[PDB]
């Protein structure tokens, strides 16, 4: 019943954990505690098998541990800066080659999977710093330039006409812009990792750069030059919606160094590069 | 079922492409690959006819390629400037002879058809540049003056009363103005091209200027003179809704030079005037 299901949604009780049943003393030639990890399987022994348990009714739910929940939180993926210093025409617009690899927090979470398919929700948080005192009337334009479309080279480039590309205009004072984007890949899922090249020569590129081109985000202050200089910083937040993930993998153990690559750097004292805290010895808790 | 149709809308699966069927080796005196282009018809041969194909279920849809989608994107068609320099009364208002020929991006798309019929959605993006520091309280008036109605000659002209004409007032800080306009032509469709004149003499006008008069857009800063001078730039965006198009034609190959005319200019090195990139020779890919 969709209504019962609805109640479960509201209470967050869609996925319930099993109860613990009462167990008793045993004397058997069936030893559940003994097994063989060589098989590559985890011994499914439960508490009732190794001790005498009481009956307990579980009320815990796994809803929050769902992939939708894990990746369904909006996090920052880019900080765009437009700092008017001495040349408005050159400093009033910029561009970014879109990717979800520049911020460690969300990158690490997505990378716990090999392939992921999801729709995106983008929320932008623009903040205008009044460097000289007033901010005037700031109107921003964020244009999505898919790979192939002409990238504007000046603040008045014809490409800004956005005759076909999707543009979002924001007026200072109005609520934060937000829009959704359908799964964009040309494949069935996004590659979080890609053990391949775009060719078979010594100079072929390796990794997700080959498969994950999302195009360019071009921004510009629509307002013409003003007396007082401003510094507009637009923070882009991304959230995954309607998510699916395949083949889980180990979490990133060392810091990230670059986008589209698993490369890392190690110091002379590697224990400083990982989160493992050295133990005094085996018996010191 | 309107509900099933609705689901198709949400999923964008209204127009599905056909599947590829499995084919087999053939030895026949029926040769589909052979035909005669002289007829003016395209040979309808499909992959199954020239190679041995496998069965494949298509999931691609043509929805996005619909005329509604192609022309249903809002693009800039005019940039109105009101720059207060030294005379408020003269510089606080202006007028534009409406047309969709001044911006290449949307112009080229509409011109891929000979006749088009559609309703219009206009969205305006005003940005006030504080030239002297403050912007005060900016209130704008955009009045549509149909051909024949009196055009205001001063910022306080009686025509601004808008006793009958449609005017839109915008207050700085409020969301972007937007309104719709029904198909305006006196004919059944708009002429994208017109091989005709408004008379039969050597001085008769040629082209769409004869048939596409939409009137005038008159703008003015309603606010009276302020201490600090401002520069208001209003960008008009246009989108076609409920569209129909007839007789497709070749896309514009060279830059546009003027409105209402197909005129163009050629340099001494024509290969620079078209998008064709010179080939080294016939066999150099």
């Amino acid at each position: 019943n969709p209504v019962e299901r609805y109640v479960d949604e509201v209470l967050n009780e869609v996925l319930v954990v099993p109860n613990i049943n009462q167990s008793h003393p045993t004397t058997s030639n069936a030893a559940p505690v003994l097994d063989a990890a060589e098989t590559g399987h985890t011994n499914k022994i439960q508490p009732e098998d190794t001790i005498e348990t009481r009956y307990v009714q579980s009320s815990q739910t796994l809803d929050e541990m769902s992939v939708e929940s894990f990746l369904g939180r909006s996090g920052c993926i880019h900080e765009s800066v437009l700092d008017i210093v001495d040349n408005y025409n050159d400093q009033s617009f910029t561009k970014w080659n879109i990717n979800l690899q520049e911020m460690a927090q969300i990158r690490r979470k997505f990378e716990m999977f090999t392939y992921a398919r999801f729709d995106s929700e983008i929320t932008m948080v623009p903040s205008v710093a009044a460097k000289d005192g007033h901010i005037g009337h700031i109107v921003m334009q964020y244009m999505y330039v898919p790979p192939g479309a002409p990238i504007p080279t000046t603040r008045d480039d014809y490409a800004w006409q956005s005759g076909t590309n999707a543009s979002v205009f924001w007026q200072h004072g109005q609520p934060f812009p937000r829009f959704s984007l359908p799964f964009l890949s040309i494949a069935s899922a996004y590659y979080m990792f890609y053990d391949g090249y775009d060719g078979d020569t010594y100079k072929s590129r390796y990794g997700t750069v080959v498969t994950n081109d999302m195009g360019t985000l071009c921004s510009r202050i629509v307002t013409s030059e003003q007396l007082h200089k401003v510094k507009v910083v637009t923070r882009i937040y991304h959230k995954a919606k309607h998510t699916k993930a395949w083949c889980p993998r180990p979490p990133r153990a060392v810091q990230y160094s670059h986008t589209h690559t698993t490369n890392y750097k190690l110091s002379s004292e590697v224990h400083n590069d990982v989160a493992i805290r050295p133990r005094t010895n085996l018996t010191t808790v | 079922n309107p509900v099933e149709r609705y689901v198709d809308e949400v999923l964008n699966e209204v127009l599905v492409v056909p599947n590829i069927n499995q084919s087999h080796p053939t030895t026949s005196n029926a040769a589909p690959v052979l035909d005669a282009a002289e007829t003016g018809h395209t040979n309808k041969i499909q992959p199954e006819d020239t190679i041995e194909t496998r069965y494949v279920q298509s999931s691609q849809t043509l929805d996005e390629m619909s005329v509604e989608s192609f022309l249903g994107r809002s693009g800039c068609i005019h940039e109105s400037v009101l720059d207060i320099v030294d005379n408020y009364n003269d510089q606080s208002f202006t007028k534009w002879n409406i047309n969709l020929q001044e911006m290449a991006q949307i112009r080229r798309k509409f011109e891929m058809f000979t006749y088009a019929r559609f309703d219009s959605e206009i969205t305006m993006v005003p940005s006030v540049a504080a030239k002297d520091g403050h912007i005060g309280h900016i209130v704008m008036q955009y009045m549509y003056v149909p051909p024949g109605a009196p055009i205001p000659t001063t910022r306080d002209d009686y025509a601004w009363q808008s006793g009958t004409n449609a005017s839109v007032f915008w207050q700085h800080g409020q969301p972007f103005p937007r309104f719709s306009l029904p198909f305006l032509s006196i004919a059944s469709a708009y002429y994208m091209f017109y091989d005709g004149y408004d008379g039969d003499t050597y001085k008769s006008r040629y082209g769409t200027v004869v048939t596409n008069d939409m009137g005038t857009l008159c703008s003015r800063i309603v606010t009276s003179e302020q201490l600090h001078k401002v520069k208001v730039v209003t960008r008009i965006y246009h989108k076609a809704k409920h569209t129909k198009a007839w007789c497709p034609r070749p896309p514009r190959a060279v830059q546009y030079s003027h409105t209402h005319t197909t005129n163009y200019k050629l340099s001494s090195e024509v290969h620079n005037d078209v998008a064709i990139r010179p080939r080294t020779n016939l066999t150099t890919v």
Partner: peptide, 29 residues
């Protein structure tokens, strides 16, 4: 876009926009 259930406890799962990407978080399982 309205999935109206009844139980009375009526549910209204409205979809305000016409693209599936526009809807909120997915249901579970």
């Amino acid at each position: 876009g309205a999935q109206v259930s009844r139980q009375s406890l009526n549910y209204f799962n409205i979809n305000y926009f016409k693209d599936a990407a526009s809807s909120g978080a997915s249901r579970l399982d």
